[PDB]
Amino acid sequence: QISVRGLAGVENVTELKKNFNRHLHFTLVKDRNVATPRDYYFALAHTVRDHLVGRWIRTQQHYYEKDPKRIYYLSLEFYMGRTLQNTMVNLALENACDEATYQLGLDMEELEEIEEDAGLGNGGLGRLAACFLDSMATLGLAAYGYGIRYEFGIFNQKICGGWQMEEADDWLRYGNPWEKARPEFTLPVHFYGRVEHTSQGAKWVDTQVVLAMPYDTPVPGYRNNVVNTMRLWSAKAPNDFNLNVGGYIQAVLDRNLAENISRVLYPNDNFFEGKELRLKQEYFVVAATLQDIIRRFKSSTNFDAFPDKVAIQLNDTHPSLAIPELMRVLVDLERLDWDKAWEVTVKTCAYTNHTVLPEALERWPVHLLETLLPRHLQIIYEINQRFLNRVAAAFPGDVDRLRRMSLVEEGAVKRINMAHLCIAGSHAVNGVARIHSEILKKTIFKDFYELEPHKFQNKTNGITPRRWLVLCNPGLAEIIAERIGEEYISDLDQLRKLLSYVDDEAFIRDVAKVKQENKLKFAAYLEREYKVHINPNSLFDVQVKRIHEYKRQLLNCLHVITLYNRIKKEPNKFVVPRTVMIGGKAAPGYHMAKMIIKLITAIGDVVNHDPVVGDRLRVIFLENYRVSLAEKVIPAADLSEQISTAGTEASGTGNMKFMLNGALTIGTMDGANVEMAEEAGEENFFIFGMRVEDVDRLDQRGYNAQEYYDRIPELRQIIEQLSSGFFSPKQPDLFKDIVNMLMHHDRFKVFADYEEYVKCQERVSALYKNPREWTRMVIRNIATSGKFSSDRTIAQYAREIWGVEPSRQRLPA
Amino acid sequence: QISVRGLAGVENVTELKKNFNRHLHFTLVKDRNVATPRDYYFALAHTVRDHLVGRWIRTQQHYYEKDPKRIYYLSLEFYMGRTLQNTMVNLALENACDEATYQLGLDMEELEEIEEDAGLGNGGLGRLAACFLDSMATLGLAAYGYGIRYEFGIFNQKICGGWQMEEADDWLRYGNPWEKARPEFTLPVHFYGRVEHTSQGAKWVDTQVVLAMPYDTPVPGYRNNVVNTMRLWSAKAPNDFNLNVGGYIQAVLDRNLAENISRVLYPNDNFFEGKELRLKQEYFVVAATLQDIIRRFKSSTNFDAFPDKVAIQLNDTHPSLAIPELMRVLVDLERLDWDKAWEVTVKTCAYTNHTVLPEALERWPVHLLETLLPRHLQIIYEINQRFLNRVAAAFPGDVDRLRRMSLVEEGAVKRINMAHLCIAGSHAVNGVARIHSEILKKTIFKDFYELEPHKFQNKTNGITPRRWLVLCNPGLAEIIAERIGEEYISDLDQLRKLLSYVDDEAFIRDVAKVKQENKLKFAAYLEREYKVHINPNSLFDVQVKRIHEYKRQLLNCLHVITLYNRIKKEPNKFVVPRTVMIGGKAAPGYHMAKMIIKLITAIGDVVNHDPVVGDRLRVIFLENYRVSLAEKVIPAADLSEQISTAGTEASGTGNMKFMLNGALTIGTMDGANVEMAEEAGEENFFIFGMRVEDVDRLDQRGYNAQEYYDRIPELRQIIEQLSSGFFSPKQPDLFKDIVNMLMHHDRFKVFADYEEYVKCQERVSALYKNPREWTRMVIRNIATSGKFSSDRTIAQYAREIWGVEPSRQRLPA
């Protein structure tokens, strides 16, 4: 049907059809009379997978023969989403499979909706890892993603009575056709025990053993025939584990204890929970990965060349134990001296920071590490002593600097600062957006920047234009390719050529048409799957992301209520119609976030059923926000809400997704928003609110929310409505905690940005009244979004951190 | 190479080779440079499996269209062993795959040794179910095996310092290519809760739900293109199971609790352990199976025809809850009246008893059933009341009969006698050998036989000649086929034609040659895999079976010691050389059985290292006895030890395996031994010891072991050796418990059969001195083993219990 989706050749379609029928018969053991739609999905999945294997084998054979420097990307999260459509896109199979299935009497889109998301991440950090894997394969890098194969990913969110309910994401229930178990590469991981010192150094003994079994998933590059590997570890008990009948039966049942390590993803985003099971997960991934790395390195004695052949990227502090584990292996097992081992470690490891929020920083209690990883604690202490000796020599007499920079934090409970460990043991440390990286050098890591300025870098985040344009928005990808060709898909900077079409009436009409089509289709989805009615002609105002106080869904709520109150005051006055969509998951233990979800639904209940409002304002909570839902709602959006308090969102990536898909942005100068506005031009962005400097000034003075309440009558009305029980008539005091936090304990200064936000929102509504100029501004956004391709980000990591040159050259098919 | 293994056609071998390479590439994602021998096994397994699927689909399509009466065989155990070779045998693919793999540079036998046993059973009862499935498919019966998919089967046995150590049988580690998960047929199973009474009968409410997910395994018939299904249930938690972060994480981890139901096989053979987890397993299999049965029946309202379309066979009392569960479904859910429901239940269900040992009888505490299955207890009480009302009318005034026949046993703890339940609710009750079935009518079920004589039947056990001749002993199958053709494989009675070859010198030589080849190969195995040296010219004296006091491995031990003592007394006297092999697993909590294993190894330690003995006597404990080991050792045996105390081994099946494979039998007149001796003629069997009547006479008098000790000097010497520490010099009192049990607490009268046993063993050694007459007696055994084919057994069940006619006709290929 459409050009960018590849060729549907006669020979190809015929071959796909016969292989589909083969899998249905031999693989699924069904025929067309008994087959369920899920059987049809699996038949297709297996058919597409067959096209990967040849390329997968020859890519790994290529790396063995050429022996390039290998990149190891260590992460506790890979938010992959669905794999079927992505694989077709990267292999140029989409139109062929579409034709083949059509001739078989099947609708491919319907089959695509059957695949479960691989939800092995919480949000931004997990999705970044997924985008990065795609870009690394597209840029021909010898890269491996290493993580944990969680049996249960991020929970499925159900809304009951306006409240979030969690249910287990049993994503492996029906099987996963994409993974390949590799039990032959099973490795032992050690826990607990004690340290013995001998003539030949230290020994870690009396340990409990857990097995790490790898599962490999192919990562295809974009039409370059490269297929890289994501290797995820699963926890397995050894067969003599804990080994009377009561005794025997119980010993077998106790195997669950060891295997619980890979059972479940911790569902916290941007929040540190110091639980032992989480620490076990962090060591488990690190210990198994490093053994696998060293094994592969030896199968090429001399560890001097290790940093020339290995790069390890630490995704946040979660895999920080890689540093003392590499030291442990090199010193204790390989018998290298400390200084040489440390040189290798530093040159091998690099660290990416993703946050400045104090509650998100990993600080593990010494007593935990003492019991679980006694040898690693000893290595950490020795690392600390030697590091502080350097600090003392560089800044003699500065005793407070020593205490500030220490990896060991003193107090009620002694803790290890994992961020401090990562800086000490890495040759590079980067933030994820220009303003974020500057904040790191100016504030939390200032002392470290003063000691080693060369170590500190910026790598602004990006998103993959394959999943986040071609896959989710084919209609937009097509109208673009009609004008400038297909080359932009792997060179997103080419979108700048679209600036010469900003006055082209044909193109303006096509951009607006594609958006309208996306909006209509998404409006149908909401009726079909959630029985909700929306006006497709209204402005689609959307904030989708995890529920957090810093992301200020509450500020959005205040604006929504303002619009409702202004309508009730002057009902017969014209307003630009809006559909306000807010979606996202709250961490199960985050009470305030759960209260915010309830508030949103409570507002919808009042607003959506007021006859006076009509279809001029609708408030909808998007249930179970996840990658597959993002792929639907993002192409349908007109307005992207990126309204975190300045200095709190390290980068954001959802912002970049909306920009690429034809939405305009209302946002603070926070994270990547600053660079987005710089690229598009500030006149083509709806910027409002305090800058980081203004937040700082307010904190020095003291933030007093009452001041805003006293001086803004519209704001006072909202607070009085919330307090009195307007949005909860049966439970008048339901929202007392929210009002209290806003009035007395608001770390994120919601009131302080309220006035500017509302006024900026008025400017949005005014522009939307003029479809032609709205669309022209949209075109200027899409055209300047090229910087935010993860291909650019990864090319920067490759050249400036890993010391490898990306390649766009095809491998033979 | 050999005829019975089928044709190796040019077109077939070429097709097998290309499909092998396809699977290696597309399925295993390997090439010939990286492939492990395990990859080669899996490539072959997948290749052979492909040939099953067409037949599997058309068999189940056939049953849908023809709608025959369906046989449901309910068992907690299916001891399947390996599947690859069995599948090749039944499909006539063995020579073709042998040729195909040879041309690929691979040894097929080596690949076959890589497959794990499916060890989902303990011994005789589990293996019987497996043999039965094979025969039901070979006889074209619409039959389904229903059980539990245990994650861990029977433990692997390791011998350390002469002691049994258990380790988890992680048989699914590498995956199981034979099974097909069917999550679409997932069914809910209820536990706990309470009973509410309404206007419309009783309701079972507030229950905990566990999901039952089926996995289907194909069961091929012998060259008839029939492929039946074994459906095994796996336990799964619902997604809202148990559904704060501590709270959230723990709730997910607690899913293990529900899923523990299918985790592990209880490793007791012939022994009742009244544990709650076992009760849950029994209900789980019953509840899911019955829903599946009724679903299939409705997909053909009127339950009058239910018994015409459904037969349920209960394998021992383990699935006895099928009776009250069928009543529950019919009465509570389908709203049938009690009397009509009961009529249907009785006509549907039949019960097979496998034991008379009191410790093996299932008697569940009322308090357990009250908490776990409150509605079923109510139904059981009502069944009991109505049954006892019939007893009271038939035998008026006989109050003690009422108490004896009651399903409810009074005492310290009230219990439900599950055997009594099964008789009441079944239209047929059978024992597993003629003497066993007579013992049932004369002793434990005498009252029930008096009430309903028509209900009681015999069905003598059998074994499948496919696995237990063609598969494990191709050389013997071939020399037989050369003389009488191939028809005997599915009509074992034809072996009688071999009686006309008992004086044929060519055949005599061939039978002896095949045995010698088997012995040599097995002697090599022991060196290669266990570093033990044996004389292949010695008599192979073997007792393989579970370790139990009733099976009297101890009596064997006494004979072994007697031979050793007689050699030490007259060293320069000639004796027929023997290799005594004893193997089998002990239940983990069975202390005495574990002591017997230690005794056997202790005897070996002394005997095997005495220079005076030389290679005239060797004692070897066969580690980890299981189906795959049985297939090796049984064809290599000369003498089969079947020496249980008369009246204790219900049938035995190992006995039949040895008879078919050219070993002579030394045995008591117990279980099937009686019928074996009757078939072959008593002169061709080495019978010794007390008959059942003699045991009874001894019990009436009082068994006094001291009498035998006082009157038999050879026996006295052995006991004094055991007591003084001759077989345990470092631990003189190690075997004190064994001596004590033998002297004071021997339920199985070991001493009473000692004299006759030793004298009978002398007659064996004498015959072995004359190879020609030994072999002629062997031929007379093999020739009369036809009765003990499970094809005969199943044909009898079909005609006399299930009311269906077996068929030998091919389905179209």
Ligand SMILES: OC[C@H]1O[C@@H](c2cc(O)c(Cl)cc2O)[C@H](O)[C@@H](O)[C@@H]1O
């Ligand atoms: O984003 C994944 C897919 O979503 C599809 C898609 C988008 C929607 O807005 C709705 Cl409501 C349903 C749907 O299947 C798109 O049609 C398809 O082009 C895209 O590839």
Ligand SMILES: OC[C@H]1O[C@@H](c2cc(O)c(Cl)cc2O)[C@H](O)[C@@H](O)[C@@H]1O
């Ligand atoms: O019983 C299974 C298989 O056992 C094989 C077999 C028998 C043995 O005694 C030993 Cl030691 C090893 C072995 O692989 C037989 O050669 C083969 O004919 C048979 O099919």
Ligand SMILES: OC[C@H]1O[C@@H](c2cc(O)cc(Cl)c2O)[C@H](O)[C@@H](O)[C@@H]1O
């Ligand atoms: O770098 C990817 C994203 O990581 C986010 C992020 C930071 C963090 O410490 C933990 C998690 Cl789970 C996470 O998603 C940042 O908040 C966001 O600014 C950034 O865009």
Ligand SMILES: OC[C@H]1O[C@@H](c2cc(O)cc(Cl)c2O)[C@H](O)[C@@H](O)[C@@H]1O
């Ligand atoms: O019927 C098969 C076999 O079942 C055996 C048997 C009986 C029983 O109650 C429980 C188990 Cl696990 C078992 O294997 C009998 O002991 C044996 O005589 C018989 O040959």
